[PDB]
Amino acid sequence: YLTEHPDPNNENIVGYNNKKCWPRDARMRLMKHDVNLGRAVFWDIKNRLPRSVTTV
Amino acid sequence: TYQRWQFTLPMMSTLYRLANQLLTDLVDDNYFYLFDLKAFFTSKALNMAIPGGPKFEPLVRDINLQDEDWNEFNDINKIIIRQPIRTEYKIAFPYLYNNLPHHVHLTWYHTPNVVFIKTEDPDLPAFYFDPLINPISHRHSVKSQEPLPDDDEEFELPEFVEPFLKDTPLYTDNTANGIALLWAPRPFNLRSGRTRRALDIPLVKNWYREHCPAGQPVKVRV
Amino acid sequence: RRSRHCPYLDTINRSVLDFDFEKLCSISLSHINAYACLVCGKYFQGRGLKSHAYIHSVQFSHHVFLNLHTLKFYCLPDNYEIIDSSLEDITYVLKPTFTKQQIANLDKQAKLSRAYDGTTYLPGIVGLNNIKANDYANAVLQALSNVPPLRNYFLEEDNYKNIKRPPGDIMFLLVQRFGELMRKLWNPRNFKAHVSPHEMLQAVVLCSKKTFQITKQGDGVDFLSWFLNALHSALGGTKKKKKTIVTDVFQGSMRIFTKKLPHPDLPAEEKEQLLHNDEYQETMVESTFMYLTLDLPTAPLYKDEKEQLIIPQVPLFNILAKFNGITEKEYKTYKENFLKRFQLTKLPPYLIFCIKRFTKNNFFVEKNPTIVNFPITNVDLREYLSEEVQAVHKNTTYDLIANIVHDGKPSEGSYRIHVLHHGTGKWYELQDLQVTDILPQMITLSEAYIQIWKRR
Amino acid sequence: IGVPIKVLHEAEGHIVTCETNTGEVYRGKLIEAEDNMNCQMSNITVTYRDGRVAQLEQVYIRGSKIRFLILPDMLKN
Amino acid sequence: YYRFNTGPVGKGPGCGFWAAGWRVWLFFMRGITPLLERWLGNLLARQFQRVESHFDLELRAAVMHDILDMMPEGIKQNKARTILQHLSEAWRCWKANIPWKVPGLPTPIENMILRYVKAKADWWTNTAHYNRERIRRGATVDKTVCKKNLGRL
Amino acid sequence: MDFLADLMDNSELIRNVTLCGHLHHGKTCFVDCLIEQTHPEIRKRYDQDLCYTDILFTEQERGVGIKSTPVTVVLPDTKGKSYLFNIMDTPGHVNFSDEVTAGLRISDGVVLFIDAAEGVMLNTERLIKHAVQERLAVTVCINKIDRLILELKLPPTDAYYKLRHIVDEVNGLISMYSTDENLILSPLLGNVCFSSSQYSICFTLGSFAKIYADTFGDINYQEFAKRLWGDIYFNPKTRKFTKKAPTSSSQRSFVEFILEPLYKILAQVVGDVDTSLPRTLDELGIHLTKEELKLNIRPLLRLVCKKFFGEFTGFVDMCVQHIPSPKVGAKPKIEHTYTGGVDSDLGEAMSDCDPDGPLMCHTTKMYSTDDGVQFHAFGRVLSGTIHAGQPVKVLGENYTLEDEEDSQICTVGRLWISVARYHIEVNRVPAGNWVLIEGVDQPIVKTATITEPRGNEEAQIFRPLKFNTTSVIKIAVEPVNPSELPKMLDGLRKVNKSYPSLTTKVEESGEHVILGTGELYLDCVMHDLRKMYSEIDIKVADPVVTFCETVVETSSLKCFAETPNKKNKITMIAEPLEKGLAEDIENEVVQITWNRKKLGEFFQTKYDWDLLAARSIWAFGPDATGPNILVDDTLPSEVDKALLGSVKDSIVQGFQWGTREGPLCDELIRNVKFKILDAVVAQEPLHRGGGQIIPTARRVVYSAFLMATPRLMEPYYFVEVQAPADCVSAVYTVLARRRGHVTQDAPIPGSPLYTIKAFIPAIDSFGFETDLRTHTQGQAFSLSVFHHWQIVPGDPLDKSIVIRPLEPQPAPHLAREFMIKTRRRKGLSEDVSISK
């Protein structure tokens, strides 16, 4: 994913999506590694599905 | 017109004597450490209100700074809290102990400690070593490390050369009154100024501006 | 000898090419003496002995590290820094040194200029990566870089360095950095087709006082105008060469005999009085007109032919109508109906036409979806603008070199461009995914945001 | 407190010349300037009226045998 | 009272420092008196949801006035009223997204109608999406307003 | 006004001086009085002082000076002409005193200030000690003399005794710091100037004597000052200074003829308008207008004191008497600041301060322009004359003759040497004068020396700047959003150049850590960063204290690491350093550059170390100042002595790297006596891989530290909390809550206040001053400066109970959780591995 989309400024967690309803201690741990893995998996899913037939 | 008043020092002395009942004894601004207008301004500009300071409705919703998500460094697993970060810490240094301070005000850091002794008995001379003043080491110091002049060999001074201010009392009866007025509150510090209207002279103003009327019920605090 | 004697130099491979990003220390946050890790790929400001670079070499085990300026890989782990010419591909990529004789080879784009990784060089039309926001600015920069004259001017570092850079203004440094990045992108020595515009975007944001920043999507016309003004300022100034090369390349001159025609509310008697007072007298404007701005006609409120969608294609003569149609314009937003009477006197060799489809209505800004309908062939608007200027403008046959068209909704929209290599005439789409697209494929059907043509 | 004596005392430390009543002109750095115009200098050059010139490591000339003195132009501003 | 009864003074009602509240009441009265003066002057004298509707009325009235300026009301009177009909027709012709061509009408009249309808459509879409955003955000809306917004959407 | 530039040419009329203060208010008041005397246009308002030295708005709003202001003018003298004084006013805070350290290299004379009522302070004592160690002249100024006269209303004799006690304490401190014979300071000697800095009342004994001569008679002012300064007593019948004190009820000469007139004038003014009657004014030889009499008590007293006491001529005379001209004073500064030695030909020429010689200017101060985009490097021009447009090579603080790439060439624009009006009309500046070089800011961070490009090819920069305080409070910096991360980083660089004490480090965990000395220091850093250097909003972390790793017990077993090349293994054992050696080495007492015989003699005499151990290769941490010392105790019987000589540099590099990055928290390690037990290595140079030793050396260091008993160490901050007597016990209560220990407590001589010296751990020091001031209801005031490293309780690697995320840990468990949190925050592996 970094080769496909670099993250030198660590801006991956800049626009992450999390559930604000849950309390702070349990909603989502926006660690750099976890955010990077989430973005990588989302990119892999988007690549495995053509942008014409559908989209994510 | 009755707009400007030019008066004398003894009148301030006696008026301050009479108004001691309504005026607090505080003379140094350090007493208003975190109760000056700037401290309340930077408290209002934030959600946190100091225990002695009133609560406020936040200017905006400020949902961004309300509950931020856990980050790599913001995690409490790494932050060590020896002592609670109370509102005093945030108000004192708004630009350090407050993530995203944004629109705040700046508070005065310190004022030199007013070292003043209020007159206790008028008969006793003003220029007197008050017992509260700490004693100093009156060491004999027979050694002469300091430079010394000639012994009856030079320094021929004319008799017409007096020590300047002479034949004038060093201590007078009005010295204590004036030196006490020099550290009076705002209304009495001015020798002579302009009048103010009757309705815009808040006597109680200096009261709540103090830290707290200690030893009071909760309703008084509120 | 010792520069290549160390096996670490062979063990040091270009696993990641991060030179596209800004050159700064990974541990010292300083740009002075920032040596890059030849194997690890991290640039630190330390030195080879008892500093940040020494720590990196003793930790990453990379006995070779390229220098900050000379780009000399460390021959010894800490002793000496002498590069080896065997792996000089990265050195040539980071150092664009194509002279005019080499520029002629660069101008011979017909040769298959395969990159280090085997991609397509695409001189000036390389599908480099663009920022997520303000991609229109990146497209405008690529289209400007698509001109081989622009690449030649950028590669002339000695000519660029000739102009003194005032210490107070940072515009010169940002312009130099952007030109160096463009030259590196257009240089055949490049390895990766995708080039990070992060340094370019930061330079643009800093130089242009945050206008057209990469943080938010920016209008193509405004970004192009700001970039042209910045380029003119970089080359112009206190020097005797007031006419900047970038400015003079696309300067132009319009002899708009502007007439302050009376307001519509003025009756016939008031109009006669104003005419007697020479109010409606034509006054030459001598407008610079760096880039022509041709506005599309009114959008079709009601679709008549096909109710689903009516596309009122504007003939290319509408752009050529500026000789008399603009000269017949008697309209202004002020109280007085100003008569523009526009007349382009001198047509610049480079013609930059802005459609300006986006326009602000009384409530929201909307874009006319009218098709461009502009053929890519010879034009005669210069002769129409001034018949006598045809002798001066012998090469009136201008072909649309690069056309960029917006797409999507005005709020969440993107852009796509197609550029043709000068001489070669590839006419390929500059989009990274669609690198090769020669046929128009209804190119004029979309609302072309801007077009750039050369007099040739 | 005179204006000329104050200008002579303020000119101490700079290069200046002094022509005495006997014709001897001594030029050098004014180390010390007295109230009565007594000037003590160090490393000065003294030229007599006959034309013979010499160098002195340190001298002190009184104002009673001094005719005139020329200071630098920095004291004019 | 807290201070007055601080010490030897009794805890009774014997407190006399009215100035502190007297000044506050004086200030509040000073603030209030403009209102009372204004209303008393009004009596002493003898004269004792519209934004979208306002803009629609402004558009239609301005277009009608422009037509009556162009169309010589001193000669033709009735047809001008019928002109309004085409206005409405044009408007619904825009709403139905159906072709609208009236060869009988003059070309400048058609251009004026096109300008009117484009301005009205822009304003109408703007207010439609604005009211939809207001409704979905949580702002309170009326039944008729909600139905109109739904129709526009 | 061209005389200001004319006097700059005369190298003997310049007086390079830097100021010091207990609090920035006192020194800046004096600077403002000087500016008002020199510049008649600027007049201080009655409500508040002008404070011309507080350029920054942060200092103006907070009330405490932030950055040193090097601004002054040509000033006259009673017995001398006008000299172009240039004074760098310094902030009056314990942490901010680090900035004053830069002024230590700006000038060779410190005109120290001490408040009359407050007396000696921790900041004043630290500044005096640092100046004594810096080899500079010291001229004391009794500040706020009106406090004793007015605020305390002490008797004149008691006031004189208090002033004499303060002077004696200052002299004792100076004598303890330095053994030079010039340590004598007294009004008779001319090293004490009584300058209240309020009401423009400044004088010396000579100033009073000159005033007496002007009033009447023709008494020689020098003799009168030499006589009336001390307690020599005056006999009216004999009418002379009579040391025998013949008169029974007479007062001392200073009390009778100096303090008494000031007391009488103050009593007449403050006492009443009729007390300061026109008759009294005429007796004092002053005729104030009716408007001046109609003013309030404070403005009237200020005007009376200013008109009566001249224009601060006494201070100028005192400075001229003792503070030398740059030509005279350049030689000691050349000896001290320059690391190239005064024996160098260029160094010898600089010692003569030749304007026409080589150009050698040392710039250490950094000042931001009004727009904030560009900076300007402020520094003294030791030798040569800098001209506008002339290129110069700016060798940085890290520049060395080994590599010429450490220096860069740059052009110098307008100079703006004159700072009183802050104008940039200066074209060229001669040697010995401060110059604000413009355009060379980019190549240099701080404390860098500019030189002529081609005139000299061997001149090197001066020694790196050193500070008495140590930055121990670290704070993380992140942007609100990463989208504009570099912009903030730009401001971060602007922070590094602007503040020499602040240290910006890019940690391996991707966090930008700012290191500062005090909480207020870092608060001012962040305010300047957000408001000026980087408008982006910045998120921070809770302040953290840099920790140290120490040993208490010797290593149980030897630790050996083998080089990959043919298994060349070095074995070592680490032992705790001898008690008291850490601060001795850290105080630059002994350097690695010293001769082997001298170091051996020192160790045998002071610490009674073995001569063979002393003769071993010694490392002593980085730059020979690290408390963790390394001794190569390898047995000479082994054949590795030649190999050790061929690997001494690699071993030293490995040791210094291990000292910089330890095994626990990778922080600094101190007081470790690393003994290099032995090493077996093949003599072949091929097997002597340079990169195979330093990692092995640091692995050996980590294993030895693990083999020995490891302990954590926190920086105990010295705090001189001054408080009224009643709250004194309550003050101890504060130290009770914040784990503080009271070291000493003494009443202030001549003042009702009371000083308490305490040693507060840095972990609980954050906000300690706020707690003390709020709990004492705004009466007590504190000031904390780092004092010494103290071993934290517990064991860093002992398996202890994991603490709660939001609950303070018990004392035995502090070390382990400190270690784990520091390791995790740094980005390294949290768990400590004995194998690693």
Numbering used by the authors:
A (entry chain A): 1113 to 1168
B (entry chain A): 224 to 445
C (entry chain U): 100 to 555
D (entry chain 53): 3 to 79
E (entry chain A): 613 to 660, 675 to 779
F (entry chain C): 116 to 951
Question: Which passages does the manuscript contain on this structure?
Answer:
Here cryo-electron microscopy analyses of human CE pre-B complex and B-like complexes reveal extensive structural similarities with their CI counterparts. The results indicate that the CE and CI spliceosome assembly pathways converge already at the pre-B stage. Add-back experiments using purified CE pre-B complexes, coupled with cryo-electron microscopy, elucidate the order of the extensive remodelling events that accompany the formation of B complexes and B-like complexes. The molecular triggers and roles of B-specific proteins in these rearrangements are also identified.
To that end, we determined cryo-EM structures of complexes formed after the addition of an excess of 5′ss oligo to affinity-purified CE pre-B dimers in the absence or presence of ATP or ATPγS. ATPγS was previously shown to support the formation of human B complexes but prevents their subsequent transformation into activated B (Bact) complexes and/or their dissociation. The cryo-EM structures of the protomers of affinity-purified CE pre-B dimers incubated with 5′ss oligo (designated pre-B5′ss) or with 5′ss oligo plus ATPγS (designated pre-B5′ss+ATPγS) were determined at 4.2 Å and 3.1 Å, resolution, respectively, at their tri-snRNP cores. Owing to the absence of the B-specific protein SNU23, which stabilizes the binding of a second 5′ss oligo in B-like complexes, only one 5′ss oligo is bound in pre-B5′ss in a manner similar to the 5′ss oligo 1 in B-like complexes. Thus, an extended U6/5′ss helix does not form. As a consequence, U4/U6 stem III, the formation of which is mutually exclusive of that of an extended U6/5′ss helix, is still present, as well as the U4 quasi-pseudo knot and its associated proteins RBM42 and SNRNP27K. In pre-B5′ss complexes, 5′ss oligo binding triggers the movement of the PRP8 RT/En domain (PRP8RT/En) towards the PRP8 N-terminal domain (PRP8NTD). This action generates a half-closed PRP8 conformation that is also found in B-like and B complexes. However, no large-scale translocation of BBR2 or substantial repositioning of other tri-snRNP components like those in CE pre-B is observed. However, PRP4 kinase (PRP4K) and the SF3B3 WD40B domain (SF3B3WD40B) are located farther apart in pre-B5′ss complexes compared with pre-B complexes, and PRP4K interacts more extensively with PRP6HAT, which may potentially contribute to activation of its kinase activity.
